[PDB]
UniProtKB/Swiss-Prot annotation, chain A:
Modified residues (N6-succinyllysine): K71, K80
Protein name: Large ribosomal subunit protein uL11
Gene: rplK
Species per Swiss-Prot/TrEMBL record: Escherichia coli (strain K12)
Molecular function GO labels: large ribosomal subunit rRNA binding; rRNA binding; structural constituent of ribosome
Domain of life: Bacteria
UniProtKB/Swiss-Prot annotation, chain B:
Residues carrying N6-acetyllysine: K46
Family the entry assigns: Belongs to the universal ribosomal protein uS12 family.
Keywords tagged on the record: Acetylation, Antibiotic resistance, Methylation, Ribonucleoprotein, Ribosomal protein, RNA-binding, rRNA-binding, tRNA-binding
Stated name of the protein: Small ribosomal subunit protein uS12
Quaternary structure note: Part of the 30S ribosomal subunit. Contacts proteins S8 and S17. Interacts with ArfA. May interact with IF1 in the 30S initiation complex.
One of the GO BP terms on file: positive regulation of RNA splicing
Modified residues (3-methylthioaspartic acid): D27
Protein's job: With S4 and S5 plays an important role in translational accuracy. Interacts with and stabilizes bases of the 16S rRNA that are involved in tRNA selection in the A site and with the mRNA backbone. Located at the interface of the 30S and 50S subunits, it traverses the body of the 30S subunit contacting proteins on the other side and probably holding the rRNA structure together. The combined cluster of proteins S8, S12 and S17 appears to hold together the shoulder and platform of the 30S subunit.
Keyword set includes tRNA-binding: yes
Gene encoding the protein: rpsL
From Swiss-Prot, chain C:
Name this polypeptide is given: Large ribosomal subunit protein bL36A
Membership in a protein family: Belongs to the bacterial ribosomal protein bL36 family.
Record gene name: rpmJ
Keyword terms: Ribonucleoprotein, Ribosomal protein, RNA-binding, rRNA-binding
SUPFAM superfamilies: Ribosomal protein L36
A Pfam family the protein falls into: Ribosomal_L36
UniProt GO molecular function: rRNA binding; structural constituent of ribosome
Function: One of the last ribosomal proteins to be assembled in the 50S subunit, it contacts a number of helices in the 23S rRNA, acting as molecular glue. The simultaneous presence of uL16 and bL36 probably triggers ObgE's GTPase activity and eventual dissociation from the mature 50S ribosomal subunit.
Keyword Endoplasmic reticulum: no
Gene Ontology process terms (BP): cytoplasmic translation; translation
Species annotation: Escherichia coli (strain K12)
Curated annotation (Swiss-Prot), chain E:
Domain tr-type G: 1-242
The UniProt record lists the keyword Oxidoreductase: no
Role: Abolishes the inhibitory effect of tetracyclin on protein synthesis by a non-covalent modification of the ribosomes.
Membrane-spanning intervals of the chain: none
Molecular function in Gene Ontology: GTP binding; GTPase activity
Gene: tetM
Species name: Enterococcus faecalis (Streptococcus faecalis)
Positions bound to GTP: 10-17, 74-78, 128-131
Lineage of producing organism: Bacteria, Bacillati, Bacillota, Bacilli, Lactobacillales
Protein name as catalogued: Tetracycline resistance protein TetM from transposon Tn916
Top-rank lineage group of the source organism: Bacteria
RNA sequence: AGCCAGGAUGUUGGCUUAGAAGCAGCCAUCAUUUAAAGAAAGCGUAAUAGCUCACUGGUCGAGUCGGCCUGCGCGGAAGA
């Protein structure tokens, strides 16, 4: 397991193939081709969905392309199609922008557990749900 | 002198050496000369057909 | 170098000495922070 | 994935061989010449099988004796 | 019979022309000074050149060695106006780059070298300044190999010390890869066994004809070591001249120069045949042109000749002689051409000093047009301001010193016209009125200009119904609106206009198309008074190619420039990025890339997107307008 | 006090979709895995990355750090 060399977790919606205003120079900043994030970017994306910003490892070598294992979208953007409102903070405690419940967010939390690291699910629960708390969202426990 | 630039449109500007013939204009007092269109730095009038011996235009190549 | 009447530590790596009685602030990091008097 | 390609006999195609050599390495024409002339001579050491077989087949195409170990 | 031409690609101030001078000394005398340090003769010719410490233009000098002619030219490797040196490539088949001891060949030299690769003609390396500290005895040559990207190998080896070895080499065993490329040399190599150096020398001559690799060279001229034998290699290795005399005679001009005592001299090479003295000859203008006089430019002094040998180059006077004009017709050659890869290398203003002397100064600019082909200028400005196509820093010093020498005029400018374009702020109603409340003419209309998307340009529609619009009346209103588009209240050109005409009351007995046409401009200025305006400026994209190691530092240039960051990509060791910056600040960008890259920088751009907006205070360039009737009424409208 | 260690996945987080990605400005200032780790005091980025400190291990082995009060001193302090 080699350490830091070039891998960076940055790209927008997984449905946006070959970006240039979003990523562009950021993905092709190194020797890796701009084409590498369209022909190979949707090779794993199509299996689930599109339009979801999902981070992926970009460990660039001298071997043209690179090795990668795609991970899990951020809880933030997940709370739009699974929250109702597409917005978020700006006014955290100043006003209650939205709300869910532990019965639904704890329900979604363990799905991301393949990427999450915890001794037990409950922990990841209060973690991700607290992430929801930062958005001005208050859990309906 | 102060020659009158005939024809329609001209490439003359600031300096640019031209050619001057006689002939008043009888409408602009003080002007007693003409410019020889097509001669020297003064190109001929664009897209003329009739009376092109004046204005310096060559015979329609087409 | 600066020769101010007041010579407080600018950077973190600034150190106060008192060579030849005259107080100085030598900085191993930034050569601009080197100052005398005070 | 660590195969060694040795050259035993260039055969009746020292020309093609020399090409394969310098081509697989990039040594000076001379160096390559001497190498072959100093047969047997190791062409590559600890190279990918694909690569090993690639040159190997090349040698065969020319008609030379190669060694794979 | 004749003698092959020889180049002198002294890239990055190689000083190779001085090597040409020392070569002129070795080829002497029997009666010559032998030259001296600095300038110094060496066919320096024009004043301000040797005084400037560098030639302002490529020269020429007749020479002979090994019982054969040996023409050579130098240096034009400076800067900066190197396109004339590219013109020199047409003037000769040979070449002789002067490699620096400083980190191999100079990066500026690489451009002329690759251009030489475009030339399709033979060249040979030279290890100049061998007698100096820090010389790359085994390092700089490696830079020559890594940079040359070919298969060049030294014809000799030397190191010092006071040593000056040349013929002692070279490349035993390991050498001969160029022979390996040949099927014949590859066959003899297939045969095995050692062989005579000449036997591989034949294949070396075969590849040498193709310019497959540059011949090796070594030694500094200052040490007087290897500066002679290398010239012998230039004499023997050089391709034979295409002598014939079969006719008919043909050729073309390569360059021309305005000597103060000339007053002009048109150099030309005899591509085929020969031209008898005082005889008529064909011209590209399709008119007869007798050769009244011509003579070879000997390095010690110019000399007349009764006739030119085939393949020979020589200057000749003429009543006229356009650059690259046919001398046949006609010669047939194919080669690439370029001029420092730029339409204009940052044009700069050049307003003449004095009320009247500047008019003569423009004629001096015409004289500049007479000189180097790679230059252009025109009075695009209404003020007839000059805008030279010439580019580079030192080249401006050359044109300026030339202005201070051969001529008696000078100017100081660089900013040039802003080329700003004003656009409407928002739609607003307006009307000139009706009848004569009022001012002439009686004709009037209710113009209704509206805001438009950027880059849309001027736009209008005939909202007025017939016959009030008139079949041949409203068009005068349109031409008049175009007349009002000629200048805004700020004096900036109109842009993104949307003038939708509405009302158009008029009286028949007094109505004229000219009256309504005069009325239009008042409606335009009136709508402009209410629009509030908004400045618009050019924002052309600016692609750039710089080495990746400096690529981060170039990002630092981004913050220093108005131009926005843009998508870019790597290209091998090279790096590239697509910029997008305003033309007003774009001129300094070439200086920025020139500084950050250490001269390794390169860039290109083209104008696009009129939309942009700029600050601050919305400054505008006066002014419009005069020389037309009705403007006084417009002045009356203001109060 | 010095010494090789460590100082995490989503956080490209919502934000004015040009970015603010611990560190322009916003408000929030999560909770886990835990010997420890601020969703961060400074540095460095177009923004990342990156380099540090907080903090905590161990090596280490005895006093040490920061205010308050005052005494007497140094600097600030160059003229014919």
């Amino acid at each position: 397991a080699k350490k830091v060399q070039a891998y960076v977790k940055l790209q927008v919606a997984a449905g946006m193939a070959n970006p240039s205003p979003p990523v562009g120079p950021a993905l092709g900043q190194q020797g890796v081709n701009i084409m590498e994030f369209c022909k190979a970017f949707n090779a794993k994306t199509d299996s689930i969905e599109k339009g979801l910003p999902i981070p992926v490892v970009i460990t660039v070598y001298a071997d043209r392309s690179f090795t990668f294992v795609t991970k899990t979208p951020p809880a933030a953007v997940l709370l739009k199609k699974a929250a109702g409102i597409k917005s978020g903070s700006g006014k955290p405690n100043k006003d209650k922008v939205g709300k869910i419940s532990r019965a639904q967010l704890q329900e979604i939390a363990q799905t991301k557990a393949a990427d999450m690291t915890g001794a037990d699910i409950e922990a990841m629960t209060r973690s991700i749900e607290g992430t929801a708390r930062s958005m001005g969202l208050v859990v309906e426990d | 002198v102060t020659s009158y630039i005939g024809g329609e449109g001209h490439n003359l500007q600031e300096h640019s050496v031209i050619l001057i013939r006689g002939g008043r204009v009888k409408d602009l007092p003080g002007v007693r000369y003409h410019t020889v269109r097509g001669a020297l730095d003064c190109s001929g009038v664009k897209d003329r057909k009739q009376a092109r011996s004046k204005y310096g235009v060559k015979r329609p190549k087409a | 170098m600066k020769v101010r009447a007041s010579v407080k530590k600018l950077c973190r790596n600034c150190k106060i000495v008192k060579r030849d009685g005259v107080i100085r602030v030598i900085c191993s990091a930034e050569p601009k922070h080197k100052q005398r008097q005070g | 994935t660590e195969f060694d390609v040795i050259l035993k006999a260039a055969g009746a195609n020292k020309v093609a061989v020399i090409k394969a050599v310098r081509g697989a390495t990039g040594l000076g024409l001379k160096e390559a010449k001497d190498l072959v002339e100093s047969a047997p001579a190791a062409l590559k050491e600890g190279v990918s099988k694909d690569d090993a077989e690639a040159l190997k087949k090349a040698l065969e195409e020319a008609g030379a004796e190669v060694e794979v170990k | 019979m004749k003698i092959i031409n020889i180049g002198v690609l002294a890239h990055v101030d190689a000083g190779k022309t001085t090597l040409t001078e020392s070569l002129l000394y070795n080829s002497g005398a029997i009666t010559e000074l032998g030259s001296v340090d600095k300038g110094t003769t060496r066919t320096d010719n024009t004043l301000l050149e040797r005084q400037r410490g560098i030639t302002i233009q490529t020269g020429i000098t007749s020479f002979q060695w090994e019982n054969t002619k040996v023409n050579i030219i130098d240096t034009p490797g400076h800067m900066d106006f190197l396109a004339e040196v590219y013109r020199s490539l047409s003037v000769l088949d040979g070449a002789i780059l002067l490699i620096s001891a400083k980190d191999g060949v100079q990066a500026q030299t690489r451009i002329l070298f690759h251009a030489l690769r475009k030339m399709g003609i033979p060249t040979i390396f030279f290890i100049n300044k061998i007698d100096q500290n820090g010389i790359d005895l085994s390092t700089v040559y490696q830079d020559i190999k890594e940079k040359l990207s070919a298969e060049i190998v030294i014809k000799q080896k030397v190191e010092l010390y006071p040593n000056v070895c040349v013929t002692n080499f070279t490349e035993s065993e390991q050498w001969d890869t160029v022979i390996e490329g040949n099927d014949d040399l590859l066959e003899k190599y297939m045969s095995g066994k050692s062989l005579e150096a000449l036997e591989l020398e034949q294949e070396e001559s075969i590849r040498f004809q193709n310019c497959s690799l540059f011949p090796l060279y070594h030694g500094s001229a200052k040490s007087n070591i290897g500066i002679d034998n290398l010239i012998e290699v230039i004499t023997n290795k050089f391709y034979s001249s295409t002598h014939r005399g079969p006719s008919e005679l043909c050729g073309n001009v390569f360059k021309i120069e305005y000597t103060k005592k000339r007053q002009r001299l048109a150099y030309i090479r005899l591509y085929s045949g020969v031209l008898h003295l005082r005889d008529s000859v064909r011209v590209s203008e399709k008119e007869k042109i007798k050769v009244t006089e011509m003579y070879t430019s000997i390095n010690g002094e110019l000399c007349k000749i009764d006739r030119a040998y085939s393949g020979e180059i020589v200057i000749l006077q003429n009543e006229f002689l356009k650059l690259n004009s046919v001398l046949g017709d006609t010669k047939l050659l194919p080669q690439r051409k370029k001029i420092e890869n730029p339409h204009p290398l940052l044009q700069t203003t050049v307003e003449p000093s004095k009320p009247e002397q500047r008019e003569m100064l423009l004629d001096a600019l015409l004289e500049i047009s007479d000189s180097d082909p790679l230059l252009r200028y025109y009075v695009d400005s209404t003020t007839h301001e000059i805008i030279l196509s010439f580019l580079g820093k030192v080249q401006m010093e050359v044109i300026s010193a030339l202005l201070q020498e051969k001529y008696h005029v000078e100017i100081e400018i660089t900013e040039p016209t802003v080329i700003y374009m004003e656009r409407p702020l928002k739609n607003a109603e307006y009307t000139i009125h009706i009848e004569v409340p009022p001012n002439p003419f009686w004709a009037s209309i209710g113009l209704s200009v509206s805001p438009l998307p950027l880059g849309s340009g001027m736009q209008y529609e005939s909202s007025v119904s017939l016959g009030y619009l008139n079949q041949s009346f409203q068009n005068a209103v349109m031409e008049g609106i175009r007349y009002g588009c000629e200048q805004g209240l700020y004096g900036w050109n109109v842009t993104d206009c949307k003038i939708c005409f509405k009302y158009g009351l008029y009286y028949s007995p007094v109505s004229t198309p000219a009256d309504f046409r005069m009325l239009a401009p008042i409606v335009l200025e009136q709508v402009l008074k209410k629009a509030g305006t908004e400045l618009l400026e050019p924002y052309l994209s600016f692609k750039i190619y710089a080495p990746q190691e400096y690529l981060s530092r170039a990002y630092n240039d981004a913050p220093k420039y108005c131009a926005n960051i843009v998508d870019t990509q790597l290209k091998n060791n090279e790096v590239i990025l697509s910029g997008e910056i305003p033309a007003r600040c774009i001129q300094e960008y070439r200086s920025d890339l020139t500084f950050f890259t250490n001269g390794r920088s390169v860039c290109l751009t083209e104008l696009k997107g009129y939309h942009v907006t700029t600050g601050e205070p919305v400054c505008q360039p006066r002014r419009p307008n005069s020389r037309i009737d009705k403007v006084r009424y417009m002045f009356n409208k203001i109060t």
